[model samples]
Target: GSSGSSGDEIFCRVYMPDHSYVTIRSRLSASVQDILGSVTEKLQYSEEPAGREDSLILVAVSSSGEKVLLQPTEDCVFTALGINSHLFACTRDSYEALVPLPEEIQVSPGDTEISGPSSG
Candidate 1:
């Protein structure tokens, strides 16, 4: 298929922090910056007027909880990704906060319990 300047396109959906997502279509050889720009445009149209900070960054997350910060200059980022790789858009300050949903985290029955003695 023609990946660029032609009819063929690769489309994927990237999710926001609130679980909302936007579909982005681009060539397989598209740079990470291209994907970020697409997401920024969607947010500008959907979000409130004053909520546009224009400081968002793209992050790639694997199904097993690996996170990769996609560089603005990086090309062909979609290659070598895992089967369930997910893209997330967030500010640079919030990059570390991006993780899998609670349902995806493995936990035991007492995972949320506090082990220290109560002061009260």
Candidate 2:
């Protein structure tokens, strides 16, 4: 219930491929394009700007080694976050190489559950 006064501006940190992250003051309801703007802009003048790969794409990594590819119009960066969930902006060409951290993967033992046929 930590609502803000403007209900528009919020803060989030997006990570790069080198494990570097940038903190941004952005809008909670911003679309992927908007968030992308801030991410590219921050790194443009702050630390790293595109590097060799200029194209940047946004992706979400869950705590269980799941990667969610967000659409250009996606606007739930604030609403879709889960525990330990974070946003990542990586080179478009390197998108396939990004994944959740091993510590956060939490892989569990595989056990099979068989379903029984129901009798009428």
Candidate 3:
């Protein structure tokens, strides 16, 4: 159940059959269920009036030894966090493939700094 040793976090774009995608930045931990739960809660609380889709996604990160959520949008509440695309792998799969971290990509507890690849 090790989450592997390396690699940066990425938001896997979840697309419906229509090809319109929703990017969800998930946690690196092996517990996808927990991560999704947290994301759902964030969306519920941050939903727009009229109970409509905010289209806002979330980027979950382990910054400074604490779990943090990055909400990049208020309209759609898009929770997108851009990271170095080269360092992290973004996919639409439910589970992520395992990969090793590069030496240059270092993540320390309590360091909320962005290193490696950039995202938008």
Candidate 4:
């Protein structure tokens, strides 16, 4: 039986190299959810109060084991998915290299903050 907080059905937005985007909705296994949540909370936020929501999250793995995620901003998230973009799941190194350049997307504040585990 599920532990109640084990996994969940969630949606993610992906951006493809072709300038298109897509929304992926599926059930995330407990372990995967844990990893994702960990990354999400630890993500740094923009220092500018106005840009605080301007963050990015790497959510999944690629065929080559890359990191795939959406911009931290809510607008970016919806837009990326709204356009039905193609997201590449490349290795961490490749993700760093291929992900949008400064002009293409906003970056995190680079100030990582850690959070304790959540009960649910």
> lDDT: which candidate is best?
1
TM-score of each: 0.66, 0.66, 0.24, 0.25
Clashes (backbone N, CA, C under 3 Å), per candidate, total 0, 0, 17, 15
Instruction: Give one digit per residue, the lDDT tens place, for model 1 in 5-58.
Output: 656577755666666667778777877677777766677555543345658787
Question: What C-alpha lDDT values do all the predictions have?
Answer: 0.65, 0.64, 0.33, 0.36
Estimate, for each residue in 1-120, the C-alpha lDDT of model 4 and write its tens digit.
755675556554333333233444534433333323333333343433233332333443232334445433323332233231334322344456554312222221111323234322
lDDT of 4 at 30: 30
lDDT of 3: 0.33
Can you tell me which runs of candidate 4 are displaced by over 4 Å? 1-7, 30-97, 101-120
Worst 10-residue stretch by lDDT in candidate 3?
86-95
When summed lDDT is taken over every stretch of 10 residues in candidate 4, the lowest stretch is 101-110
Answer with 1 or 4, whichever has the higher lDDT. Answer: 1
lDDT of 4 at 65: 32
Q: What's the true lDDT of residue 113 in model 2? A: 22
Superposition error at 113 for model 3 (Å): 31
